Amino acid sequence: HGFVSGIVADGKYYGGYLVNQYPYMSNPPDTIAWSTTATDLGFVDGTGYQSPDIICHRDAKNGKLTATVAAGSQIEFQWTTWPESHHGPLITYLAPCNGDCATVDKTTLKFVKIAAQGLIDGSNPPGVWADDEMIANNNTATVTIPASYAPGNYVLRHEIIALHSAGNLNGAQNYPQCFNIQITGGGSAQGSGTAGTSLYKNTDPGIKFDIYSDLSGGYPIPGPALFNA
Ligand SMILES: [Mg+2]
């Protein structure tokens, strides 16, 4: 099952929600990662884009702990094994908790896209994608928290969208993974957020997308606009 087993922030490792272990316990370890029930298929497809499952994945509940991270520094996400067939983008978001992330109602979170990578090279379909880069980087993805971002408590939502079946309506498969973070330092900037259940439609061009035919039209990364300044 492809999921995030842990992250590195401020040079410090935080173990994630081990979906292969923790669900099988009454009292799993505390983690900054949200708990999920995604022990079966492992994804949320287009039929679930307006369900609460798209927010933090299936039946997700708040993580108990929070990780500090300096604005302007990097977070590394460590993925477990990713199938080569599962080509697609990697997208990362922040939603402010305006309060404690351990108790925030996830249906109220409004996410800002802070990082996104798409089709890297489509010369030879199905091409080389963000997820391919992640695999080549020892199954790790890295993002930078914007240096200008306002200090505060945020849910960090990191997602792969696998496109191997995405020419089918509702065929794109989304793998969101959420973490509680506290951004320190920083500036006063914040993006305008989008509700989790408003991030994607099954008819979006980067959602209903054929990776196998000529890619001379590029790939339009889905979701709301990337934060800049
Ligand atoms: Mg599942």
Side-chain angles (χ1 to χ4, degrees), residues 37-43 58:
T37 60
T39 53
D40 190 359
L41 292 175
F43 62 79
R58 197 166 92 108

Coordinates of all heavy atoms in Angstrom, one line a residue, residues 37-43 58, ligand 1:
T37 N -8.7 4.9 7.7 CA -9.1 3.5 7.5 C -8.7 2.9 6.2 O -9.4 2.1 5.7 CB -10.6 3.3 7.8 OG1 -11.3 4.1 6.9 CG2 -10.9 3.7 9.2
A38 N -7.7 3.5 5.5 CA -7.5 3.1 4.1 C -6.7 1.9 4.0 O -5.5 2.0 3.5 CB -7.0 4.3 3.4
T39 N -7.2 0.8 4.4 CA -6.5 -0.4 4.4 C -6.9 -1.3 3.3 O -6.4 -2.4 3.1 CB -6.8 -1.2 5.7 OG1 -8.3 -1.3 5.9 CG2 -6.3 -0.5 6.9
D40 N -7.8 -0.9 2.4 CA -8.4 -1.8 1.4 C -7.8 -1.4 0.0 O -6.7 -1.9 -0.4 CB -9.9 -1.8 1.4 CG -10.5 -2.9 0.5 OD1 -9.7 -3.6 -0.1 OD2 -11.8 -2.9 0.5
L41 N -8.5 -0.5 -0.7 CA -8.0 0.0 -2.0 C -6.8 1.0 -1.9 O -5.9 1.0 -2.7 CB -9.1 0.6 -2.8 CG -10.3 -0.3 -3.2 CD1 -11.4 0.6 -3.9 CD2 -9.7 -1.3 -4.2
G42 N -6.9 1.8 -0.9 CA -5.8 2.7 -0.6 C -5.9 4.1 -1.2 O -5.0 5.0 -1.0
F43 N -7.0 4.4 -1.9 CA -7.2 5.7 -2.6 C -8.7 6.2 -2.5 O -9.6 5.4 -2.1 CB -6.8 5.6 -4.0 CG -7.6 4.6 -4.9 CD1 -8.9 4.9 -5.3 CD2 -7.1 3.3 -5.2 CE1 -9.6 3.9 -6.0 CE2 -7.8 2.4 -5.9 CZ -9.1 2.7 -6.3
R58 N -9.5 8.2 3.9 CA -10.8 7.6 4.4 C -10.9 7.6 5.8 O -10.0 7.2 6.6 CB -10.7 6.1 3.9 CG -12.1 5.5 4.0 CD -12.1 4.1 3.2 NE -11.8 3.1 4.1 CZ -12.7 2.1 4.5 NH1 -13.9 2.2 4.0 NH2 -12.2 1.2 5.3
Ligands
MG1 MG -9.2 2.1 1.3

